[PDB]
A paper describes a structure:
Botulinum neurotoxins are the causative agents of botulism, a lethal paralytic disease, but are also one of the most commonly used therapeutics for the treatment of numerous neuromuscular conditions. These toxins recognise motor nerve terminals with high specificity and affinity by using a dual binding mechanism involving gangliosides and protein receptors. The ganglioside-binding site is a pocket built around the strictly conserved SxWY motif on the carboxy-terminal end of [name]/A14. Three HCA mutants, [name], [name], and [name]/[name] were characterised using ganglioside-binding assays and X-ray crystallography.
The resulting HCA [name]/[name] showed even further increased binding affinity than each individual single mutant indicating that their contributions are additive. The resulting dual mutant [name]/[name] displayed the highest potency, 5.5-fold higher than [name]/A wild-type. Using the same assay condition, titration of [name] showed improved binding affinities of KD = 0.11 mM and 0.22 mM for HCA [name] and [name]/[name], respectively. HCA [name] and [name]-[name] presented improved binding (EC50 = 0.19 and 0.14 μM, respectively) to [name] when compared to wild-type (EC50 = 0.45 μM). The high-resolution crystal structures of the HCA mutants in complex with the polysaccharides of [name] for [name] and [name]/[name], as well as GM1a for [name] were determined. The most noticeable differences reside in loop 1225–1233 that is shifted considerably in the [name]/[name]:[name] structure and disordered in the [name]:[name] complex. Mutation of H1253 to lysine also shifts the interaction of this residue towards the central GalNAc3 moiety rather than Gal4 with which it only makes water-mediated bonds via its main chain. Additionally, in the [name]/[name] mutant, the more distant R1276 (NH1) forms a direct hydrogen bond with Neu5Ac5. In particular, we identified the dual mutation [name]/[name] as a high-affinity binder to [name], which translated into a toxin with higher potency in the mouse phrenic nerve model.
Numbering used by the authors: 874 to 1270, 1274 to 1297
């Protein structure tokens, strides 16, 4: 039982339809594909930055009663300018002669619109704030699912969860376009772009289980993610965020075995008046993940990869390490001269999943040199200083949010902050 009417995927050297219908795909000259993952497609605010799918005539939506759904991932750069404030722009267009469906965006909004041949319309909308300290949505990959049941509602899901639903049983015949245009249409911000991936159309209303499964399956959950949702990489400098203490950042008081890594504050804020106000993300000692036991030639960090962690202090690389030999649960982490690590413990097991199954935010399980767990890396308040530690206390704990959850943040043009140093 195959409900896919379009499944747009990058294979070999081409974007192609992997559905049974084999619709034709025309790509403009200014479409960018991410080298690390060519399924990630960047569309600028330019006439030539477009992808047009010409649908088989027989699968064009033209009905009073047929249910259908769409799914895709999107990464939306922060809105930077007041010209975006009240400017709805189409991004995925299947409207013709004022009937059909489309996906549009606006300041802090993702919008679905349906319209019948008598111009009766209904919309469902996801809204997100740009005035939030740490956003789950701004410039981070979002999984969108929209379902349409002609007997009752359109529904919009975000990361597998229902956000909005609205009645559409009053709409009559909807006759959509023969082509789907992926293109910024009516956007007045000349600098705007989006990233998109994994666009699908389905000839049914997807149920909650199907949507959750699709989210889980397209998540690439064997691969660790950076803060934006891209693949976490080796050899790439990252700023660290601890989710349980998000107003602080990592620093090293002094390099060497008598120093320690710790959380210090304030992070401070980035703002453009009445457009955004967020915590500064480009703060503290950068981490670089290094290959240790990975067999893959590529630069991708996978679940259970055994690695080293380097830390950058005054533009020079040091090794994250601890002495595991004294009794005591928490092992304070230091930044060591790489040539002088000696018999200190440094091997880290990178985790994208809680157990074989359940996906968690990044964790780093430090090993001793006999291969026993020293514990997940987090932090411990030693009176007035929160020092970074590895601690098996974390390993024994529920599935609540703990101090061992981290995000890895690289500099990205959709965020727009300037690195201070
Ligand atoms: C709440 C707390 O401190 N939890 C610790 C845990 O501490 C245990 C025990 O819970 C605690 O009551 C006791 O604290 C007493 C102290 O030892 C005495 O010297 C003092 O006179 O009075 C204190 C209160 O009676 O200490 C115990 C440990 O010696 O110990 C575990 C390790 O087994 C953890 O350290 C736990 O704190 C967690 O540590 C985590 C990292 O491992 C992480 O940082 C968590 O933030 C933190 O909750
Ligand atoms: C629910 C709770 O907070 N438990 C605390 C316990 C209690 O103090 C017990 O009574 C210990 O005997 O102490 C500790 C520990 O000993 O590892 C961890 C934790 O902070
Ligand atoms: C104060 C607070 O909200 N959370 C603290 C948690 C504990 O889990 C709870 O205090 C009790 O278990 O301890 C720690 C950690 O896990 O790294 C630091 C964190 O700040």
């Amino acid at each position: 039982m195959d409900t896919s009417i379009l499944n747009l995927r990058y294979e070999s050297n081409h974007l192609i339809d992997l559905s049974r219908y084999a619709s034709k795909i025309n790509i403009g000259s200014k479409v960018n594909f991410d080298p690390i993952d060519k399924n990630q497609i960047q569309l600028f605010n330019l006439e030539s930055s477009k992808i047009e799918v010409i649908l088989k005539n027989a699968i064009v939506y033209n009905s009073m009663y047929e249910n259908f759904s769409t799914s895709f991932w999107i990464r939306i750069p922060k809105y930077f300018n007041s010209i975006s404030l009240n400017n709805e722009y189409t991004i995925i267009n299947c409207m013709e002669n004022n009937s059909g469906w489309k996906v549009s965006l606006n300041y802090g909004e993702i919008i679905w619109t349906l319209q019948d041949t008598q111009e009766i319309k209904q919309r469902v909308v996801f809204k997100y704030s740009q005035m939030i300290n740490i956003s789950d949505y701004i410039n981070r990959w979002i999984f969108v699912t929209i379902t349409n049941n002609r007997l009752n509602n359109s529904k919009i899901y975000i990361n597998g969860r229902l956000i909005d639903q609205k009645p559409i049983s009053n709409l009559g015949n909807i006759h959509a376009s023969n082509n789907i245009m992926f293109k910024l249409d009516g956007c007045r911000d000349t600098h705007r772009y989006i990233w998109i991936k994994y666009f699908n159309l389905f000839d049914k209303e997807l149920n909650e289980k199907e949507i959750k499964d699709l989210y889980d399956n397209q998540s690439n959950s064997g691969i660790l993610k950076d803060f934006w949702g891209d693949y976490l990489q080796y050899d790439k400098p990252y700023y660290m965020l601890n989710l349980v203490d998000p107003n602080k950042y990592v620093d090293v008081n002094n390099v060497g075995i008598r120093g320690y890594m710790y959380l210090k504050g304030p992070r401070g804020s980035v703002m453009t008046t009445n457009i955004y106000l967020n915590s500064s993300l480009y703060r503290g000692t950068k981490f670089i993940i290094k290959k240790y036991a990975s067999g893959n030639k590529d630069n991708i960090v996978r679940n259970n990869d055994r690695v080293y962690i380097n830390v950058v202090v005054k533009n020079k690389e040091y090794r994250l390490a601890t002495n595991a030999s004294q009794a005591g649960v928490e092992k304070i982490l230091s930044a060591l001269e790489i040539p002088d690590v000696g018999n200190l413990s440094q091997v880290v097991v990178m985790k994208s999943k809680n157990d074989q199954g359940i996906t968690n935010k990044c964790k780093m399980n430090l090993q001793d040199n006999n291969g026993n767990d020293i514990g997940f890396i987090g932090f411990k308040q030693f009176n007035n200083i929160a020092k970074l530690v590895a601690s098996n206390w974390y390993n024994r704990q529920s599935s609540r949010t703990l101090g061992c959850s981290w995000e890895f943040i690289p500099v990205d043009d959709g965020w727009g902050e300037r690195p201070l140093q």
